[PDB]
Design a protein around this nucleic acid. Structure first.
Lengths: 97, 91, 112, 77, 252, 135
RNA sequence: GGAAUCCGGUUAAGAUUCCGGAACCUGGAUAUGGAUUCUUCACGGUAACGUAACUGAAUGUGGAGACGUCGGCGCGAGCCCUGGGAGGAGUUAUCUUUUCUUCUUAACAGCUUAUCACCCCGGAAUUGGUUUAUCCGGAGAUGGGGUCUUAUGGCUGGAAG
RNA sequence: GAUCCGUAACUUCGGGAUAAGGAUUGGCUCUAAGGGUCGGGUACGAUCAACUUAGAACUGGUACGGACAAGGGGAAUCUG
């Protein structure tokens, strides 16, 4: 599943949660992938897709809200976008994700 | 501690009004004074302001809804009817 | 323990008839009539009070200079630097999407 | 109803062609712990406001009343 | 006898509506060219409580097609709408909750509210809280639409009459008991003047057809004909049955 | 990739130039003993040239198309980077860190950007840059 | 709802109205200085935003006017209570460093001053902050640094005359 | 009045309930508990200011909510 793939990047890769750290990693060219929650505001989702196309980064959309995106990264708070800085030994880069 | 056995919120009415009338009030005053999940920001902040008006604290979006709960049982199936009827148009 | 009177012929405790008791240089108490308090100006989008704007009763905004009623930005004393900020994000991205929406229909009319 | 703090800005005030009059008010005060000293107040009356210049150094006060114009109706105390 | 109370109801002295705090007449947009040829998009700016009414109201601002200005209309808030939503009013608009469409452009079974009777009267039917009509069928020639009103009474209306998809918010309101004479007081305080309506059987023979006697009783039949006279219509006017309704009233 | 480069066009979202389009002249991706964050040196357009038609005469076509520029150090977070690109070599040398700190150099560097930006807008290269963003 | 006035004194009887001093508003003409300008219509700050100014008609948008009731909490003002000291009056067979009393500072103006709110840096589970009342934080907390509202208070001018 | 004890049937479980029913209460002299602010390189002490509660001794013509102020209570029936 996609949630199995994210669970390895939290435990064996590098990442940033939240919006202001994500668009920072877009500006540095350090992002590999961004996963946006479903219930993000459309304007925030529109610039995160615009920051990706300026960096040729792939955008994945999570199938759920910010409460259940923060669950898949294994945290008790709610995250709106998770930005994969480094695929570890996981395979989110090489899959449809 | 547990302060009252069964009257709950309706213990403010005391001994008056008839017990079956204070039971139907307790079914709805729990619902209208509860906090509901916001659809938009995903926070549990939505409180009623007036009958049919449900405002969220942060992101400040005000959604119209039922008089004592956010989504009534009638209007939920309405939204899925019009969902069904619309996809018979685009297909 | 010096009791006090109103100074005008309205003897009722209305909104326009507020009293603060002050000590005069004659050593006596005298009431002075206080005007009703100014509200802050609110933002046209979010409704929050917007900062850098002086809070005066509405006709007193004609006695003060321009820099008490404005900030130095587009939408100065009208919007609140965060509704202005999302206004520029929203104006840029939709009008850029409209550039996409032009040419994405120019492939459908070229391939039908 | 307005204090002037620059002594040379006070001197350009006296020739502003509406200031017909002024006054020099002397107050017996103490210099913050002990002994008394002489503070003087130079009040000029403009056409819409009264300007005040407080002078604590009583020597510098003496060099200022000679610096007043000869036309000003100076009211000592 | 004297003039009885429901005859004084129509002279409109103290029996008019207490209409200070009302936000305005809740109305659809007028049928201009955009509403009947394509669509137009407004923004719902505020969902607001209107006094005297159980349903919330929605200020929806639109762009004036012929002048550079903005036009605010005051819709009745259908259940589900939120401030900031884009509302699409017109013929060729989409079947979403909140969009007001003509009835000819919706499929059979669509649940709409605030539906017009004549095309252009800006909203007449299914307009109190919780209510809705059901479009049950089309007659495309002589173009008409059979709908079912909230009272269950079926009605054929024009296919160009408009209506907003969804049911009207604030529903389930009357399931809560008032419990108090104070809540009924404050309920009717912002509507009219008919809260404390003393039973006509406790009045005197001047004041009512029911008054008098050494017991409190009506004395004659309380079902009064339709062809009766103003002043006699006290009781159940033109009642075709009385007593407790046992069985399926619930008209087919 | 690092798209904040020395030719990229950005849109300021914060502070007296909000909505005014800039071009990054020198990206400083991290730090300083001055401004301690990722900041870019931008040259911008403060008063856009107004629209000009066939009706405008010879001394109105000049008056309509003046350009008031500005130069600015701005945070990366206060920039919205665009896809657009503008040539920068005409004022690469003049705009630097030494340009600020001594405001006497600021006005002598603002003239070069005005001469450069007006030279684009006449024979109108870069049409998106010299139009006021509408918000 | 609303443009803008305070103190002191005066009468046999008037006073926020008269008198002395000191302000503010509205409408109107207007002269000089300051500001802006050879990049014509100001610059500074990353930003919140700053300021002695810093053109802007038609039309449009927005804010103020403009708002319930109750409860507890915080803050201010006045009053009450109290200490020393500088005056006056009372008690005093005996006692009482005692009993009473004066010790005041207006409108307006300059500088400074706050809860809330916002900005920058940073990126938090071992969850943290925090209210009398449990709400807030990856939609960016705690923290460090700042910006504003000036109710309000302090100082100075008014003003000790 | 206040403080402490003790409270029934019945109940719509919220009440009834100050149920009913008892004890204490002054003055004086003490005891104990409840606080504020200051200096610790990257365990405490100085000092200041409160009326609240509990207890002990003594004392008196057994008095003490000493004037003022300030519920009579219960078992039921009809009725709203």
């Amino acid at each position: 599943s996609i949630n199995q793939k994210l669970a390895l990047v939290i435990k064996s890769g590098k990442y940033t949660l939240g919006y202001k750290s994500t668009v920072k990693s877009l500006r540095q060219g350090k992002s590999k992938l961004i996963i946006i929650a479903a219930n993000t505001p459309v304007l925030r989702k529109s610039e995160l897709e615009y920051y990706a196309m300026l960096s040729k980064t792939k955008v994945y959309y999570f199938q759920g809200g910010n409460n259940e995106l923060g669950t898949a990264v294994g945290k008790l708070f709610r995250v709106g976008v998770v930005s994969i800085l480094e695929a570890g030994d996981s395979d989110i880069l090489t899959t449809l994700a | 501690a547990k302060r009252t056995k069964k009257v709950g919120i309706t213990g403010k009415y005391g001994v008056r009004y008839g017990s079956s009338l204070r039971r139907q009030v307790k079914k709805l005053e729990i619902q209208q004074h509860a906090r509901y999940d916001c659809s938009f920001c995903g926070k549990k902040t939505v409180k009623r302001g007036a009958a049919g008006i449900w405002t969220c604290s942060c992101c400040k979006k005000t959604v119209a809804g039922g008089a004592y709960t956010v989504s009534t049982a009638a209007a939920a199936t309405v939204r899925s009817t019009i969902r069904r009827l619309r996809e018979m148009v685009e297909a | 323990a010096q009791r006090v009177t109103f100074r005008r012929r309205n003897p009722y405790n209305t909104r326009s008839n507020k009293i603060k008791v002050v000590k005069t240089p004659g050593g006596i108490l005298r009431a002075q009539h206080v005007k009703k308090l100014a509200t802050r100006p609110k933002c046209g989008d979010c409704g929050s009070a917007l900062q850098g704007i002086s809070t005066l009763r509405p006709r007193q905004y004609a006695t003060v200079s321009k820099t008490h009623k404005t900030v130095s930005r587009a939408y100065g004393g009208s919007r609140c630097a965060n509704c202005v900020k999302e206004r520029i994000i929203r104006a840029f991205l939709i009008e850029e999407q409209k550039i996409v929406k032009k040419v994405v229909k120019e492939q459908t009319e070229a391939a039908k | 109803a307005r204090e002037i703090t620059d002594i040379k800005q006070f001197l350009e005030l006296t020739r502003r062609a509406d200031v017909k009059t002024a006054t020099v008010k002397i107050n017996k005060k103490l210099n913050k712990a002990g002994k008394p000293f002489r503070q003087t107040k130079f009040k000029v009356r403009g056409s819409s406001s009264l300007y005040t210049l407080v002078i604590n150094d009583a020597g510098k006060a003496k060099k200022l009343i000679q610096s007043l114009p000869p036309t000003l109706k100076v009211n000592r105390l | 006898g004297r003039v009885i109370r429901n005859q004084r109801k129509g002279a409109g002295s103290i029996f008019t509506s207490h209409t200070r705090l009302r936000q305005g007449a809740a109305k659809l947009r007028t049928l201009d060219y955009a509403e009947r040829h394509g669509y137009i998009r407004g923004i719902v700016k505020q969902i607001v409580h209107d006094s005297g009414r159980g349903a919330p109201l929605a200020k929806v601002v639109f762009r004036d097609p012929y002048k550079y200005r903005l036009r605010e209309e005051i819709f009745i808030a259908n259940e589900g709408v939120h401030t900031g939503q884009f509302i699409y009013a017109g013929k060729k608009a989409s079947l979403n909750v909140g969009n007001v469409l003509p009835l000819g452009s919706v499929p059979e079974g669509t649940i709409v509210s605030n539906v017009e009777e004549k095309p252009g009267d800006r909203g007449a039917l299914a307009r109190a809280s919780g209510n809705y009509v059901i479009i049950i069928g089309h007659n495309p020639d002589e173009n008409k639409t059979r709908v079912r009103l909230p009272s269950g009474a079926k009605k054929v209306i024009s296919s160009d009459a408009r209506g907003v998809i969804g049911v009207i918010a604030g529903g389930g309101r009357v399931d809560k008991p008032l419990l108090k004479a104070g809540r009924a007081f404050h309920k009717y305080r912002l509507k009219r003047n008919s809260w404390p309506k003393t039973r006509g059987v406790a009045m005197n023979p001047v004041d009512h057809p029911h008054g008098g006697g050494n017991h409190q009783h009506i004395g004659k039949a309380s079902t009064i004909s339709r062809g009766a006279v103003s002043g006699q219509k006290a009781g159940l006017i033109a009642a075709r049955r009385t007593g407790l309704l046992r069985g399926s009233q619930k008209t087919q | 990739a690092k798209f904040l480069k020395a030719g990229k066009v950005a849109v300021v979202v914060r502070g007296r130039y909000a909505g005014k389009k800039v071009v990054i002249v020198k990206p400083h991706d991290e730090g300083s003993k001055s401004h301690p964050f990722g900041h870019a040196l931008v040259a911008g357009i403060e008063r856009y040239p107004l629209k000009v038609t066939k009706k405008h005469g010879a001394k109105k076509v000049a008056k309509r198309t003046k350009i008031k520029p500005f130069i600015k150090v701005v945070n990366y977070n206060h920039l919205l980077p665009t896809r657009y690109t503008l040539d920068v070599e005409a004022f690469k040398s003049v705009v630097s860190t030494e340009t600020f700190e001594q405001p006497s150099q600021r006005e002598e560097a603002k003239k070069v950007v005005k001469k450069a930006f007006e030279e684009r807008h006449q024979a109108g290269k870069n049409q998106w840059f010299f139009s006021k963003l509408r918000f």
